[PDB]
Structures are given as C-alpha cells and as structure tokens.
C-alpha cells in the first residue's frame, strides 16, 4: 500500500518509455515560421542579377512583395527581355512576372505565355523542356486568377511529359484544388486528386479550405463514387477538420471566401457521415421464376378467380 | 566528422552483458553530441561543414537529447502527455522497438565511553509508546494488533 | 537471498534513467563575446528582461506609466481633485494647535 521509511528507498525499476516509443512532434497549432506560399526558386546567374537589378527591384523577391502595378512589370519585360541573350535568364524573369501578376490578380498576363513560351513548350509536340521555376509560376498564376489554362500545362507535367509533379509543393496542390472547386470542374478535381495520390503527396497537410472547396464542386455521379473511396486516404484528425471547415464555410464563416459556395447537400451529408464513421461512437432470373409458378398455382386452386 | 562518427558508431553498438534486458544502453552516449557541438562553436569549426548523413544522425541525437528553456516550461503539460499516450495507443505498431518483434587508520583499539557528557546538551523528548500487554497471559502474542507496531 | 534490496542503484538503471530524458541547451552556458551593454536589457517585449522585486528595479516601467498617465488624463479633469486643507478652509474654525 505504501513504502515504509526504514526500508531502503531505492529505485524499484527503471522506465525506458521515450526510447521504446519515439514520437514525432505533433501540435494542434500550425508552424509559425512556415512560408505558407508557393516558392519559385529564383536561381539567376550572378551577372544578370546585377544587370537586371532595376528591373528585378520591382519584382517579388524572397518574402517581399512590392506594390508595383503589373502593367509596368509586363511593359518592362516586353521591351527589355529580347535584349538579354540568355534563354534561362528570360524564363526566370517571366517566372517573377507571372508571380507578380498572380498576387495582384491581373487576368491579361496569359498572353505572355502565348507570346514567348507556348510555341517552344506546349505547341504541337515541342521537344523542349521548360524550367521548373516557370511551370510553378504559371500554374500559381492560372489558379489565382481562375484561368482555364492550367489544364494543358498540368497534363504536360505527368510521367510521360515533363515529370514535374514529384517536385510540386504541398501549397502548390493547395492553390490548385481551390481554383478547380471555384470553377467547378468535376473531371479536374478527380484528375488532380488521382495525381496527388499517385505522387505520394502530403494529403493530411493540404489546406482544409482548399479540400472542402474542391469537394463541394463534385456533382457528377461517377466522380462522386471516386470521392467516397478517396476520402479514406485522409487521416482521422484531417477528416474531422474537413467537417468543421465545410460546416463553417457554408454557415457563419461564409464571408471568408471571395466567392461563396454553391449548395451541394449530397457532399455535405456524406462528409458529415464519413467524419462520424472515422470518429469513435458517442439471381433475378431464378427468383422471378418462383413468382410466376405461384400465381399459376393460385389460379388453379381458385384463389385468383375469373370474371363473375 | 571522425569524432561524431565514432560517437554514432559507439551509440549504435549493442551490448551483451545486460543482454538487452530493458533497453539499449549505449544510446545515452548520443547525449554527448549537444556538448561537443557547443565545443565546435568555441573551436570555430562550422557545423554546416558536416556531411548530410552525419548531419542526419546529429539532428537525430539532438532531437532525442536537447531542449530549450521555452520548451521546458511547456513540455510537461497534461495535454501533451495525454496526446503521447493516445498516439501510443492508436499507432504504436509503427514506432516501437518491441512491437516489430577517531581516524580509522590510527584507531586500532577504539576508546569507548570517553566521558562525553550527554546531559549538557538537551535531548529530553525521547518518549516511546509500547503496545499494551507484552507479557500478559490473556493477550495473545500473534495478532492483527502487531500491525500497530508500524505506525508513526 | 529472499528480500534483497540494493542500497546502490546499478549502472544499467542509471544509464536507462539518463537515456530517457533530454538535456537543456542553456546548461552549457558558453560565452565568448562579452555582455551586450546596450541591447540585451532592451530587447523585444515578449522575451524582455523583466524586472522583479522592488520598485527601484523598474526604471523603464515607471517612465512608461508616467508617460501613459500624462497622455490619457486631461488637465480639466485633474483640476477638480482637492486636498484636505482646501476642503477644510470652508470650515469656520479650520486651524488650531494640537
């Protein structure tokens, strides 16, 4: 019941619990020092950086966003970039222009893709391979302005194409799914979510408002059966947070979104059903043969009479 | 590089004298790693000039044995302890070592009772309470009242 | 043996009790630059050098309190507060020796 004081007060047995169970760090709060954005990996040679320094000054650098309007930035790239005789310098320059037009939401910057990069990357079987910094910046641009030009570029990043999908960020898939749910592409939701599953992305650490917007746009019956089997791939902490996020974005916290959600009740009830499931509790031919001989028997017995 | 690799080679060494009765013993030598790294900060040896494999082992031993003062004020909250218990209960099949399976040298004739007066100093409160009926013929020697002998 | 309890904890048990608990990084207390005579007591407010004990150790806090009190309080409010003799002057016999 106790230990007597005249007994020797030695340690009974040592306990090695932290070396038997090695626990990864898991807090309910998110990391306060994460970038929470799409990184571009500006890898300019250190001679064009000094040369284009008054032009790269008005462009977004690392964790810095200048207030330069985008019509001045596109006008600087239209005039000054054919003077620069380097292919990788002009491509990394346009990656910052696509990033600057994404943060300010200028829808007219997709003409810069058709002007310079479309004919050598995405036109009629182009053999050239674009840099990863350029494809990340244009996919971040088309998702931010809700442009439909993401689809031809995303199909180029597959294993038969450029194979740039294993190098995608978790925030790259977060801004991806938010735009497709806003536009309402049922096949675009399935083709991205199949690609995230095949590429082994961090499905639990996708932004929760991005998932519930992409899941809200599922209305077709064949893709609705895909979401049922796909929703088991999330964790139990994630799928209980998707229910609280879906209920808030359609309820009181509907003002957090720029465009309000559409009323999809079949996905609201199924997410609420699936989150309760993962949480703890708190022969037609032979059968039709049998029916016909019974009616044959009741007419012979007289239970089904004729006209009187 | 050579010293930290010798530390990681000694810490991953299994022993055979306790025959792994409770856990691995040499892992505590990874506790030497947050010391020696600080010595590098005194020696001017940059820790970024270490190889990636050794840096992985050094960050392993650092997240096993290092804490700061700000974490030490919050690491014992019951929320984190019960989250540890719940994470061991839910998925402990993924992280468990067992779930995979005078002076004595000049003393020779000691002088006893050297007229040191114990009545100058005061130790008067030496009262003791003995149980009733030690030699009584009607009171039994064995009994549950023997449990009264251990109570202070 | 039948009741053997050791009076010295064995080396294996000491090693297991040492290997389970981490170290505090500020126990190394290494120092090679010197003391920051100008900045270290004037750092950011969440991690600041907070004074303790007597009011003589609160130099900046008394200054900030006096500045805030002079900031928020108007003078047209502070005119109305009177002392005791200013009220006692209206008595017909305000002053006499004790």
């Amino acid at each position: 019941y106790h230990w007597h004081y005249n007994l020797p007060q030695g340690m009974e047995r040592p306990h090695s619990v932290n070396r038997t169970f090695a626990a990864p760090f898991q807090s309910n709060h998110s990391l306060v020092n994460k970038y929470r954005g799409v990184w571009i990996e500006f890898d300019m040679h250190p001679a064009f950086s000094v040369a284009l320094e008054p032009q790269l000054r008005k462009l977004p650098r690392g964790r810095t966003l200048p207030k330069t309007p985008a019509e001045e930035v596109i006008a600087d790239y239209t005039a000054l970039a054919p003077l620069v005789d380097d292919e990788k310098t002009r491509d990394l320059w346009l990656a910052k222009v696509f990033q600057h037009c994404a943060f300010q939401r200028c829808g007219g910057a997709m003409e810069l893709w058709e002007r310079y990069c479309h004919q050598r990357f995405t036109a009629e079987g182009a053999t050239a391979k674009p840099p990863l910094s350029l494809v990340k910046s244009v996919l971040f641009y088309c998702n931010k302005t809700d442009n439909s030009g993401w689809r031809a570029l995303f199909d180029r990043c597959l294993k038969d194409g450029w194979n740039y999908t294993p190098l995608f960020d978790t925030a790259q898939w977060s801004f991806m799914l938010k735009s497709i749910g806003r536009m309402g592409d049922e096949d675009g939701v399935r083709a991205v979510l199949e690609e995230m599953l095949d590429v082994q992305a961090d499905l639990d650490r996708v932004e929760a408002r991005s998932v519930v917007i992409a899941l809200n746009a599922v209305t077709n019956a064949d893709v609705y059966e895909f979401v049922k089997k796909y929703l088991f791939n999330f964790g139990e902490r994630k799928v209980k947070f998707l229910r609280t996020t879906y209920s808030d974005l359609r309820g009181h916290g509907a003002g957090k979104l720029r465009i309000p959600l559409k009323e999809n009740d079949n996905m609201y009830y199924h997410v609420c059903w699936h989150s309760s499931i993962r949480s703890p509790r708190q022969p037609n031919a032979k059968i039709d043969d049998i029916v016909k001989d019974k009616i044959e028997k009741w007419k012979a017995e007289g239970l089904l009479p004729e006209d009187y | 590089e050579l010293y930290l690799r010798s530390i990681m080679d000694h810490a991953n060494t299994p022993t055979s004298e306790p025959l792994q009765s409770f856990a691995n013993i040499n892992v505590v030598e990874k506790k030497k790693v947050p010391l020696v790294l600080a010595q590098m900060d005194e020696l001017g040896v940059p820790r970024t000039h270490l190889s990636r494999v050794l840096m992985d082992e050094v960050e392993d031993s650092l997240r096993k044995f290092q804490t700061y003062r700000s974490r030490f004020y919050e690491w014992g909250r019951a929320v984190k302890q019960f989250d540890f218990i719940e994470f061991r209960r839910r998925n402990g099949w993924l992280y468990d070592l067992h779930l995979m399976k005078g002076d004595i040298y000049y003393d020779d004739t000691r002088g006893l009772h050297d007229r040191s007066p114990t009545w100058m100093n005061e130790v008067p409160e030496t009262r003791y309470d003995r149980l009733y009926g030690v030699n009584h013929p009607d009171i039994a020697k064995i009994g549950i009242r023997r449990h009264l002998n251990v109570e202070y | 043996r039948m009741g053997y309890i050791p009076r010295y904890t064995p080396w294996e048990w000491i090693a297991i009790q040492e290997a389970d608990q981490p170290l505090i990084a500020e126990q190394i207390r290494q120092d090679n630059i010197g003391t920051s005579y100008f900045f270290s007591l004037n750092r950011y407010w969440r991690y600041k050098a907070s004074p303790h004990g007597y009011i003589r150790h609160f130099e900046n806090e008394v200054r900030d309190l006096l500045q805030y009190v002079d900031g928020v309080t108007p003078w047209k409010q502070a005119q109305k507060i009177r002392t005791y003799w200013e009220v006692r002057s209206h008595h017909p016999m305000p002053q006499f020796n004790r």
């Binding site: 040592p14 619990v17 626990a23 | - | -």
Partner: peptide, 30 residues
C-alpha cells in the same frame, strides 16, 4: 491519492514521421 512515478520520464516527442524519413532517403538518393 495514488502516487505518481518519479522514475518515469516526462513524455516528450523525440522522433520523425515515416514521411520525413522517406523524404530524407529520397533527397539523399537525389
């Protein structure tokens, strides 16, 4: 009251995920 163990260590996180170890192996292979 039931006594708490004073020779049992405080539960703290010292380890990595399976995903973090897989990404470390992948980056070292690259």
């Amino acid at each position: 009251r039931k006594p708490q163990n004073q020779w049992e260590g405080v539960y703290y996180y010292s380890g990595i995920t399976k995903r973090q170890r897989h990404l470390i192996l992948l980056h070292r292979k690259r």
